[PDB]
Amino acid sequence: MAGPVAVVLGTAGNFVVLAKSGISTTGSTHVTGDIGVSPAAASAITGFGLTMDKSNTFSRSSLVTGKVYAADYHPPTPHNMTTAVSNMETAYTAAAGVTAPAPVVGLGAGNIGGMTIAPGVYKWSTGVTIPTNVTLAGGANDVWIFQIAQTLDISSAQKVILSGGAQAANIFWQVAGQTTLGTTSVFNGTILDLKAIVLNTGATLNGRALSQTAVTLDASTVSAS
């Protein structure tokens, strides 16, 4: 009802971590959902201790509640991963291209720390920083699309707070540079990144990390919403 139309993820929506060049973990990581890489092979998934299913279509990890997929697994996984990664590229470009309603440009000159942000399209030609908690306030069906030309950072122990009914499933962060989630930060939404998504020690992501390069997790928590 308020803000832009929600970004369509297609089968990229079936993953909580999706990458083209790799996924790496160290420490006490815990992922709730499915993860996958393509066109990289399973060797580009590191630190997860993968065990192939007898089908050879997926693997299981002690750090993943769901399934692990990779481009070198048995049919139909290669085709399904090609479709997911194409759907991720489509979503990235769709999100970057949203024009309506009229975007707010350069909010906070890139520093949105301490703000309360209504449903809408927000665009920066700069990077964005979150040095102190930011609140996204709106209803259960309201949408936020963030369009970021450079880096996205949230500082150590800061959060994206949701209020009013705001749901992580309706919050899209389109980022052309690296996204870094600082130590012990709490982040909400689907990250559509052209470059790396890096979760520093003990960071939490409620939503999805959808990278066209690599995702790194350091004792981090990733969970679908």
Side-chain angles (χ1 to χ4, degrees), residues 148-161:
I148 303 169
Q150 307 189 40
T151 55
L152 171 64
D153 276 84
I154 180 167
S155 293
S156 293
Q158 310 309 304
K159 306 188 294 307
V160 177
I161 300 167

